[PDB]
Amino acid sequence: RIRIRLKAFDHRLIDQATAEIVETAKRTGAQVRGPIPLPTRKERFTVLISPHVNKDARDQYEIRTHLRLVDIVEPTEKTVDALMRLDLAAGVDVQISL
Amino acid sequence: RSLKKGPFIDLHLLKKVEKAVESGDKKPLRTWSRRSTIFPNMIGLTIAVHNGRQHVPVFVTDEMVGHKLGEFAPTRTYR
Amino acid sequence: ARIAGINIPDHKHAVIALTSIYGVGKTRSKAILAAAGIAEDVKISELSEGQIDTLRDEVAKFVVEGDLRREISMSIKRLMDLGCYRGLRHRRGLPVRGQRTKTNARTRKGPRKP
Amino acid sequence: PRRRVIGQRKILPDPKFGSELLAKFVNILMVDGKKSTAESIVYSALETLAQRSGKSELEAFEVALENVRPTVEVKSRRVGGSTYQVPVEVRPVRRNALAMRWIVEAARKRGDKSMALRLANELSDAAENKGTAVKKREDVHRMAEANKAFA
Amino acid sequence: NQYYGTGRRKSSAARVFIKPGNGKIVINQRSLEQYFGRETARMVVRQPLELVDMVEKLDLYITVKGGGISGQAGAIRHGITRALMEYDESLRSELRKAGFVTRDARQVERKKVGLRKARRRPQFSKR
Amino acid sequence: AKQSMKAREVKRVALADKYFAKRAELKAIISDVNARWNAVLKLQTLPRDSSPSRQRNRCRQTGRPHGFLRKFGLSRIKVREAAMRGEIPGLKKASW
RNA sequence: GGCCGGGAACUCAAAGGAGACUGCCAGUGAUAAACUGGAGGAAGGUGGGGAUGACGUCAAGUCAUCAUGGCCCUUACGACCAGGGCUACACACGUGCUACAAUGGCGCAUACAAAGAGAAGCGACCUCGCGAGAGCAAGCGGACCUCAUAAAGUGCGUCGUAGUCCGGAUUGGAGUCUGCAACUCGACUCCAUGAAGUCGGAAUCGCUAGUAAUCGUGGAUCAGAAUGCCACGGUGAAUACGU
Ligand SMILES: [Mg+2]
Ligand SMILES: [Mg+2]
Ligand SMILES: [Mg+2]
Ligand SMILES: [Mg+2]
Ligand SMILES: [Mg+2]
Numbered sequence: 001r002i003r004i005r006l007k008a009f010d011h012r013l014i015d016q017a018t019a020e021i022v023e024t025a026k027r028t029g030a031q032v033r034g035p036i037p038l039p040t041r042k043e044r045f046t047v048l049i050s051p052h053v054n055k056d057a058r059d060q061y062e063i064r065t066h067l068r069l070v071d072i073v074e075p076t077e078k079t080v081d082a083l084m085r086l087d088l089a090a091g092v093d094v095q096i097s098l
Numbered sequence: 099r100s101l102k103k104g105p106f107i108d109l110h111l112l113k114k115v116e117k118a119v120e121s122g123d124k125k126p127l128r129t130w131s132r133r134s135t136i137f138p139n140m141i142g143l144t145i146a147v148h149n150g151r152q153h154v155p156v157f158v159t160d161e162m163v164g165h166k167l168g169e170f171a172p173t174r175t176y177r
Numbered sequence: 178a179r180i181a182g183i184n185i186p187d188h189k190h191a192v193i194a195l196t197s198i199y200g201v202g203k204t205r206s207k208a209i210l211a212a213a214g215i216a217e218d219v220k221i222s223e224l225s226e227g228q229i230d231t232l233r234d235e236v237a238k239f240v241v242e243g244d245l246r247r248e249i250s251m252s253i254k255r256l257m258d259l260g261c262y263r264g265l266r267h268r269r270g271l272p273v274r275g276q277r278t279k280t281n282a283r284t285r286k287g288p289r290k291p
Numbered sequence: 292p293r294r295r296v297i298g299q300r301k302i303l304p305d306p307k308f309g310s311e312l313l314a315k316f317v318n319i320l321m322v323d324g325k326k327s328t329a330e331s332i333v334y335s336a337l338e339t340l341a342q343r344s345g346k347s348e349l350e351a352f353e354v355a356l357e358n359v360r361p362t363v364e365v366k367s368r369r370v371g372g373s374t375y376q377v378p379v380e381v382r383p384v385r386r387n388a389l390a391m392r393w394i395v396e397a398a399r400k401r402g403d404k405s406m407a408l409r410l411a412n413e414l415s416d417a418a419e420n421k422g423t424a425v426k427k428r429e430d431v432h433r434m435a436e437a438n439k440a441f442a
Numbered sequence: 443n444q445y446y447g448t449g450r451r452k453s454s455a456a457r458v459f460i461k462p463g464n465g466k467i468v469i470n471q472r473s474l475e476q477y478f479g480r481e482t483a484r485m486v487v488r489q490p491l492e493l494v495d496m497v498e499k500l501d502l503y504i505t506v507k508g509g510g511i512s513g514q515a516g517a518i519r520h521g522i523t524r525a526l527m528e529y530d531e532s533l534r535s536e537l538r539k540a541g542f543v544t545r546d547a548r549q550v551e552r553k554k555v556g557l558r559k560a561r562r563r564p565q566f567s568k569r
Numbered sequence: 570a571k572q573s574m575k576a577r578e579v580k581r582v583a584l585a586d587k588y589f590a591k592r593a594e595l596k597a598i599i600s601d602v603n604a605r606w607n608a609v610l611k612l613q614t615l616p617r618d619s620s621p622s623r624q625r626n627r628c629r630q631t632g633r634p635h636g637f638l639r640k641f642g643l644s645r646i647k648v649r650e651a652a653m654r655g656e657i658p659g660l661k662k663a664s665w
Numbered sequence: 666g667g668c669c670g671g672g673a674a675c676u677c678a679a680a681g682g683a684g685a686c687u688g689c690c691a692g693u694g695a696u697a698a699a700c701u702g703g704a705g706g707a708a709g710g711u712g713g714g715g716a717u718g719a720c721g722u723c724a725a726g727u728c729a730u731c732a733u734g735g736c737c738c739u740u741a742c743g744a745c746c747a748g749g750g751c752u753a754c755a756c757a758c759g760u761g762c763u764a765c766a767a768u769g770g771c772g773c774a775u776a777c778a779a780a781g782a783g784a785a786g787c788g789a790c791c792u793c794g795c796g797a798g799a800g801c802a803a804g805c806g807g808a809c810c811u812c813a814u815a816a817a818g819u820g821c822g823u824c825g826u827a828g829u830c831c832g833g834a835u836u837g838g839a840g841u842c843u844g845c846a847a848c849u850c851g852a853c854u855c856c857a858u859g860a861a862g863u864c865g866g867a868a869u870c871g872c873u874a875g876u877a878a879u880c881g882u883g884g885a886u887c888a889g890a891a892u893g894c895c896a897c898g899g900u901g902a903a904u905a906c907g908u
Contacts (some may be wrong), residue, residue, distance in 0.1 A: 015680055038677040040634040041781090041806050044663060045885070046555070046635060046895055052727035056556030060663035060716085061772085066665060066679080072650075077605025099840070100847055104607060108845090109614050130747055149849085150749040162259065167847035169261040174753055174903060190823080193830065202857060203830080204795085218823070249837045249858080262849060271754085273836065275850055278754055284835045284860050290755075292873080292905045300874080306485055315903090320768080323879040324901035327481045327818055328768045382906075392903090404825055406768060446675070452875080453779070453898080455676050478776055478819065507676080510777050511818070521724045545707045548875045551898060552665065552714065561877080565870040567759050570730060573744065590785090602800080613845045620845070621785075622888030633730040638885075646730050664716040
């Protein structure tokens with residue numbers, strides 16, 4: 001209904017993006033259960049550090065993908081206004097699906 | 099063993115086999131493809147298989163249908 | 178108990194006895210006993226003379242002993258006469274399936290010599 | 292182990308009987324880090340020991356172990372180009388440690404069926420001494436007394 | 443009111459409850475002997491309940507997930523000691539000596555580059 | 570990294586949509602246990618460089634045919650040069 | 666059957682904090698630094714582990730990843746394409762896997778993981794085949810769905826010291842899968858065959874605690890070939906008197 005799932009890579013970026021959506025909704029409206037933390041997927045890669053030879057020496061890499069879920073339980077015609085296009089997107093992906 | 103259903107062969111070499119039956123066999127044909135397999139229609143026809151230098155005269159025989167053309171041309175020379 | 182082939186085992190299981198003969202092993206040994214209706218755990222001791230011929234008939238269907246020895250050898254001898262890659266690979270004493278002859282070919286090639 | 296002296300960490304005791312001595316014994320017998328299959332052999336050996344000998348449970352293996360305790364051992368010097376063996380009094384912590392090792396090593400050389408049986412046969416011939424562990428315990432002792440010179 | 447205690451042992455989370463009733467052991471809707479605990483780690487669940495006046499003292503419901511045999515067993519060991527909050531901070535002072543309240547900080551080591559598993563450096567040719 | 574091999578690669582990739590992909594529907598559903606005729610297997614006289622799993626998948630910057638990760642689409646040497654200059658988002662020194 | 670209201674405690678999950686600083690106490694020490702011991706505490710003396718590799722050395726490696734001085738070829742050392750080789754074989758060495766077995770083999774039954782990966786993809790459930798797999802074919806861009814039925818271990822039975830139900834090499838016959846294509850030169854399965862080896866000379870390698878060792882799973886690479894590598898967990902020691 002208002003099931004919105006986010007994605008962000010940074011250790012603290014979405015925490016401020018998922019803050020502003022809460023107090024915007026619950027002020028004029030009601031309910032709004034809040035941000036679910038969700039399990040972080042971590043894609044761990046390993047590549048050779050030297051351009052030639054050197055099997056023992058390598059560099060390890062990781063990309064942490066942090067998810068969040070909004071969950072607004074109240075679909076009012078007032079709270080749907082001032083929700084869309086006040087997000088001010090800082091590269092945070094947003095999706096509207098069940 | 100391999101190739102599942104149907105014996106896979108090359109198109110261009112099938113025309114050379116049909117040339118040897120219809121127009122008749124004359125000399126050993128110089129073929130670069132080792133991918134095709136021997137059939138009953140290829141029995142009693144002279145063929146030649148390339149293997150890194152020049153085409154070796156491989157004579158076809160009744161019981162060679164079970165194996166490929168590539169087996170009869172050794173690539174690596176020894177001694 | 179002669180039991181078809183010349184090999185005569187005794188004081189062991191029926192599953193062990195059938196594996197000892199040429200051209201028959203652990204998989205077929207279950208199928209021969211299951212066909213006749215015989216248990217795996219029963220020994221050769223305490224077994225009737227009429228009960229022997231049922232197992233003797235089933236093992237006699239598939240080619241075994243010296244007939245299968247030459248069946249594989251004739252297919253090798255035929256394959257060597259074809260003048261193929263695998264044919265020259267048999268007679269010279271090297272691996273036929275395409276293993277590394279550089280090192281660890283000691284089974285098919287044979288012991289090290291000067 | 293140059294500067295840093297150890298804390299000598301304590302293992303947990305044997306859960307059935309409550310003997311801390313048998314907790315070290317099961318660890319020597321253990322191979323591939325399998326404590327479950329290790330104790331199954333040890334308990335099977337101990338039940339056959341007390342039944343055959345007709346003695347009590349806890350003191351059957353204890354008196355058997357007491358006979359295979361080494362009196363003294365030697366240490367390799369290598370100081371002035373020549374190898375010297377100097378005899379030294381083994382400590383009570385090391386005494387049973389080497390004893391439990393030489394029981395398993397002696398049982399390993401046998402040609403018997405099960406590990407429970409062959410180890411129990413080694414425990415059976417510990418009180419009256421014909422075995423391999425009792426031959427193994429007296430090795431440095433023959434070299435000792437001669438090496439009493441160096442002290 | 444119920445009496446709670448968590449505990450865990452090598453990524454094996456457990457949840458212990460204690461009530462005043464009968465001495466039956468319920469674990470994941472199964473008995474203690476029917477939880478296969480015959481060999482080593484048979485009575486490590488009742489290790490913190492060794493030195494107490496028991497007879498038939500308490501109900502218990504325990505549920506553990508993660509790890510293997512001894513990982514789940516040692517989680518119940520540390521889990522019951524936290525669940526002694528019925529008896530509160532009186533009986534823990536004697537339990538300090540045993541060291542069952544101590545949560546074990548030993549965890550499995552990460553695999554390292556150029557090593558076979560965490561420590562073992564693979565061998566090399568002569569000198 | 571030998572720009573002719575990259576020119577050979579750009580050719581190889583550019584034939585994937587034309588000869589196969591669309592007209593590679595032949596041999597998938599058609600060559601199966603149905604109802605045989607061998608004339609469908611005689612359609613393999615096509616140029617062959619269009620093949621769906623032919624490409625080595627070279628690095629897009631340099632053209633090294635080694636250490637190519639599908640995620641980044643770059644070779645191991647260009648991963649370290651890129652990663653230490655940022656550019657890949659949420660990427661840093663992995664330690665746990 | 667958490668399966669369905671519902672309850673939100675808790676496990677799990679991850680944003681922000683507290684906590685461990687020789688600080689509280691005792692002793693020793695130039696009264697200072699510090700050390701030993703004890704209390705409290707989940708964690709005590711850099712808590713465990715990782716990232717973090719000084720100035721420089723070996724004119725160490727990489728002109729073959731790229732960049733680039735100079736030199737050289739330039740109707741060729743360039744370019745395109747077929748096939749071949751990179752997988753050869755009287756030999757020598759290193760690095761691994763699987764073993765030589767009753768702490769084990771084989772068969773039936775049964776319990777407990779974590780870390781992952783997935784749309785040109787991972788593939789339920791169902792039917793067919795002894796099997797590898799094939800056809801039909803939901804769900805999920807992913808705490809849902811899929812790979813995934815983890816194995817050691819444990820419960821009974823068989824085997825009772827043999828070149829064996831130990832070990833799997835090698836070879837033959839007959840199959841599946843990926844792809845224009847498996848002969849040189851594959852993975853995997855089916856039947857059959859069952860080399861050597863029964864603890865390995867001198868010598869040599871690693872490791873001080875969830876470590877050695879042992880048993881499994883996953884990923885990157887990749888259409889399709891791991892016993893390598895990387896990542897994860899299960900069981901789990903011995904011995905450290907000393908320099
Ligand atoms: Mg260039
Ligand atoms: Mg390729
Ligand atoms: Mg630092
Ligand atoms: Mg240099
Ligand atoms: Mg075998």
